[PDB]
Structure 1
């Protein structure tokens, strides 16, 4: 199963070689017939357990509304925005359109029954099929990590029995393709471990680590943590290749450069290709691209973004300003008054085009000339609908009222009767963020980006991402701020028109979003929503409460049945019990090492500690950055780290069988068969919480071991017999 260590004598201290023989490749692959028979048997058992009773919850389940509805968005082609990279939603769109799905069903809210036009059981079959293949990848990953055959069989059956992966993979969720491609990344990298790192099999394993690793990174950004984990194991392996003296330096740089190329080139290539399929298939424009730039939207079909507006704007032109940084922007004023300050006409950001977004450019002092908007030309923004100027009296702000800066601006005045110096706005063109040419000097629509400074207060026109709830709902705030952010201060003009200009005027339109700017803008909205995704959710959890399996998340409640994600607790608590016991035993082997006693004698203990530093390090890199996030997160974010936890627990069962009971392996197989038997018992008792199959209430009360997990336990009937003589509602 595992060979003895091949250490050799260097010039200072002994060193370990890192070139496995072909015997190590033959011992840990499916070279026999009995092993292929047990992989086929585990594929039958897994394909029964992970795919039992499918389409019995025949309504939408937790976040199946999201990724199902987004799959519908990729089918219809109307653009949308989600926190995640496209591959494991566009992949459900390919499975859906492969199954005959034509949009036609907005996945609205949990409990909506599926019509018989949407293929969901085929999408559920894809999700639970990849959630079934990750079990067989855990077997093969474990055997490639160097593991007894039967203990990989019973640890991987113990993984097919794990409740949290049956729940998370059975439905239209994100962690099932994600977990398949993370499991294929550790699969292909542990296949790379056992090959002599120069042969063609090793580079095939690096390429499979590349496409699976970057196909995990392109499905959900926790795959980037698998890129980090693989990379830290590359620092491990390249460190021991430096430690090998029979390997030339050109060999170490060839493994390091090809390792770098297959393991950062191919993930970034596949990530960029999958975003190209994202941008190339999602071509229509809906309300999903409502907070994108108008050059982003210029690539989309059926636009309301204005094209061929008048470039050179003059004094006397009915114009419409648009805020640069905040996407929901227009200078907007309409006949509703403030609740605070001076209670005058309000100035807001309304993101859609109206006639109330219109403003005249008139001087402080309508002629027959075309006086251009030079840098420093003070103007008065005259709103043409409600007969008012733009006024910045020094009163209290509406909703950002706790502001020594950020002076409040309003709209009040009479044309010809009430025009004062406090309605002036000095146009100051920012010459850096404007594109060069004529637009850098004077104001060109869509091309320059100026800043309106108030001539009597010295403050600049300002807005940010805080709306107004009083009147004109879902409209942001216009202020007149000093020492506000220069990014949030930029304004530019679109949709301008004056009579003092011919009809043969050089128009201008947007530069429509080269693919790099499309990519970077889309990721700025990814990071912007992802950082600012704060909602009060009742099943929201805390990352230090994950490894103990308290207060799991709920999924579905209809017609006296429920679905609820709590993991296999006798596998969960043994995973994290082994995080504790392995931390304790590696501390006592450091202190027992340096204190004088010799550690790491037998090769099985060495490969145990090496592969549990590997797998424990996978637990560290997929769980510690979830502490470093100022956002909401649920129990299913622990679950990629819990895959490395059940790998390391696999090696724990291997060190129970293979080292501490070398003379009596019947007791090692006895410990593993009682652990597996208790695991399958925990699945069999908690099967009616996964599949949405009926319990009874007197056993649903008994099943709640911890009081922390709570899944509407009065939903069930008092007996299993009443479900047969029962009709079920459909929403």
Structure 2
């Protein structure tokens, strides 16, 4: 199954050649009939296990409301905003519409029973079918990595039995398409490992690594960590190809440049194509695009974004300012008072268009002239509804009260009876962020981006992403800050109208959402929500507690049944026990190596350490960046790294059978049949926590090995016999 090492003599030291023979390709593929028969038996067994009892939880489960509801948003066409890239939500939209789904069911909250109009068991069938194909991709990935036939059989049967993938793959979740394309990326890249890197088979494996790698990258952003894993693997392989002397330098640059083309240009190409189908299918405008720029929303149908506003604005014009950087922005002022400071009329950022967003630009000093808004024009913003100015007395801010900077601004004044110098706002056009031309000189609606400096305090008009809970709910704060951020200080004018201007006036509209701007803006909202996603979810987990399987996450509790994610613990603890044992044994092989003793003599131990560095590196690159994230995260974020852990433990069972029991392989098969038998026993005991099938309480109490995991253990009845005499409620 694995060949001996082919080392040759360089001018200094022996080098290993990196051109695999055709025999290495023939020994590790399905060249026989018994192997195809065992892939057929593994697909029958996996297709029974991963697809048993489907549509028995006939209500929505944890994060089936999210990705199911977003699939409904793709069918309805109304735009939504989610953290995740589109392909493994739009893919459930294609699987939905292929089954006769026409929106019509907002996936609201956990427990809503499905009507007989929504195809969910076909979506559940798609998710569990990709979750059943990733088992066969683990078998073939492992066999391509250089592995005994029967040990890959028993380890992939041991992977179809893993509880966390049956829970995570059974429902409408992102990690079963995600895990399918990650498993297809390690699949196609290990198929690339065993080919001589010049033939057409190796470039077919690079093309499948590209489309599966960027089809993983466009499903969830942990696929970019598989791009990173494959990339570090390619630094490994190019290191050993530079080590190979029988390969010309032109061949090494050819494998490196074609590797660069198929492994970054194809993921970025498929990522841009899948965002093009995202932006191309999601054409309508709903409340999901509430926090996008009005040029972004200008591409969506059925708009309320103001189009054809008056470009040239003069003094005396009823205008409406809008904050640039914060998406929920208009200068707003309505008759409700503060609880602190001066308790005057409040100035807020209200995101929707009202009549209270109207402001007269009046001079500090009504004529028949059209005095333009030049750079440096001190004005007064006169709110036309509540008969008040914009006033910036130096008092305490409402909710940003711990600020030596950030002076507070309010609304108070009498038109013609109380007009003072503390209501003045010099217009200072930022000439960089405005488009050049007339708008860079004077104020143009939608085109210039000015800054209102208060004339008698020297402070600018400022706002940021903190709302106000006192009065005027879901409205942000307007302040007048000195040394506030220049990005958050920019204002621009829209929806202006004055009678001192003819009817044949040059109107202006927004640039209509170019795709690169659509793409980069959408990803700034992706990274902005993903960075600022802090919520109290009581089933939230910690990244340093994932490799020990304590305190798993809960899914669904209704009608005396529950669904809970806790992996196969006797496989989980052997994966991570093998992370510890392999780390310890490679430390003792480095100390034992340099101390004088020879290591890595037998080729099975060499391929063992090479491939477990390859898969331990997949455990590293898919789990170590989950420590440097300031967000909430659950046990199903360990699980892409856990796939590389069960690959590495697959090789662990291979080094149990193949090397340390060479003379007696019956005992190696005995270790693997006790590990596999204990794994299938852990599945058979914990089957009524996955499928949402009846346990009894006297066994549900006994099953909790650790006190960390706890899944409403008094939900079940005293015996199974009461489940046959039961009617079940539907929310």
TM-score range, shorter chain: over 0.9
The C-alpha deviation readout for 1:105-125, integer Å capped at 9, x for no partner, is 000000000000000000000
The C-alpha deviation readout for 1:30-83, integer Å capped at 9, x for no partner, is 000000000000000000000000000000000000000000000000000000
Give the CA deviation at 1:659: 0.1
Give the CA deviation at 1:481: 0.2
Match of 2:8, SS state, is strand
Match of 1:465, SS state, is strand
Rounded to whole Å, the distance in 2 between the matches of 1:710 and 1:463 is 45
Rounded to whole Å, the distance in 1 between the matches of 2:43 and 2:286 is 43
The C-alpha deviation readout for 1:483-513, integer Å capped at 9, x for no partner, is 0000000000000000000000000000011
Alignment pair present for 1:344 and 2:344: yes
Q: Name the residue aligned to 2:714.
A: 714
The C-alpha deviation readout for 1:504-552, integer Å capped at 9, x for no partner, is 0000000011100000000000000000000011000000000000000
Pairing 1:316-335 to 2, within 5 Å after superposition: 316-335=316-335
Rounded to whole Å, the distance in 1 between the matches of 2:727 and 2:414 is 70
Q: Name the residue aligned to 2:647.
A: 647
Match of 1:518, SS state, is helix
Rounded to whole Å, the distance in 2 between the matches of 1:721 and 1:342 is 70
Q: Name the residue aligned to 2:293.
A: 293
The C-alpha deviation readout for 1:612-664, integer Å capped at 9, x for no partner, is 00000000000000001000000000000000000000000000000000000
Match of 1:290, SS state, is coil
Give the CA deviation at 1:705: 0.2
The C-alpha deviation readout for 1:258-292, integer Å capped at 9, x for no partner, is 00000000000000000000000000000000000
Unaligned runs of 5+ in 1: none
Rounded to whole Å, the distance in 1 between the matches of 2:675 and 2:527 is 42
Rounded to whole Å, the distance in 1 between the matches of 2:386 and 2:646 is 67
Q: Name the residue aligned to 1:671.
A: 671
TM-score (norm 1): 1.00
Give the CA deviation at 1:594: 0.2
Rounded to whole Å, the distance in 2 between the matches of 1:215 and 1:568 is 28
RMSD, aligned α-carbons? 0.2
The C-alpha deviation readout for 1:76-135, integer Å capped at 9, x for no partner, is 000000000000000000000000000000000000000000000000000000000000
Match of 2:547, SS state, is coil
Rounded to whole Å, the distance in 2 between the matches of 1:64 and 1:260 is 37
The C-alpha deviation readout for 1:686-715, integer Å capped at 9, x for no partner, is 000000000000000000000000000000
The C-alpha deviation readout for 1:273-322, integer Å capped at 9, x for no partner, is 00000000000000000000000000000000000000000000000000
Match of 1:69, SS state, is helix
Match of 1:185, SS state, is helix
Aligned residues: 731
Match of 1:82, SS state, is coil
Rounded to whole Å, the distance in 2 between the matches of 1:632 and 1:120 is 28
Give the CA deviation at 1:415: 0.3
Rounded to whole Å, the distance in 1 between the matches of 2:396 and 2:628 is 37
Rounded to whole Å, the distance in 1 between the matches of 2:113 and 2:393 is 56
Rounded to whole Å, the distance in 1 between the matches of 2:357 and 2:641 is 51
Give the CA deviation at 1:138: 0.1
Rounded to whole Å, the distance in 2 between the matches of 1:427 and 1:446 is 15
Pairing 1:252-401 to 2, within 5 Å after superposition: 252-401=252-401
TM-score (norm 2): 1.00
Give the CA deviation at 1:9: 0.3
Rounded to whole Å, the distance in 2 between the matches of 1:148 and 1:423 is 82
Alignment pair present for 1:31 and 2:31: yes
Match of 1:495, SS state, is strand
Rounded to whole Å, the distance in 1 between the matches of 2:671 and 2:14 is 37
Alignment pair present for 1:198 and 2:198: yes
The C-alpha deviation readout for 1:184-223, integer Å capped at 9, x for no partner, is 0000000000000000000000000000000000000000
Alignment pair present for 1:456 and 2:456: yes
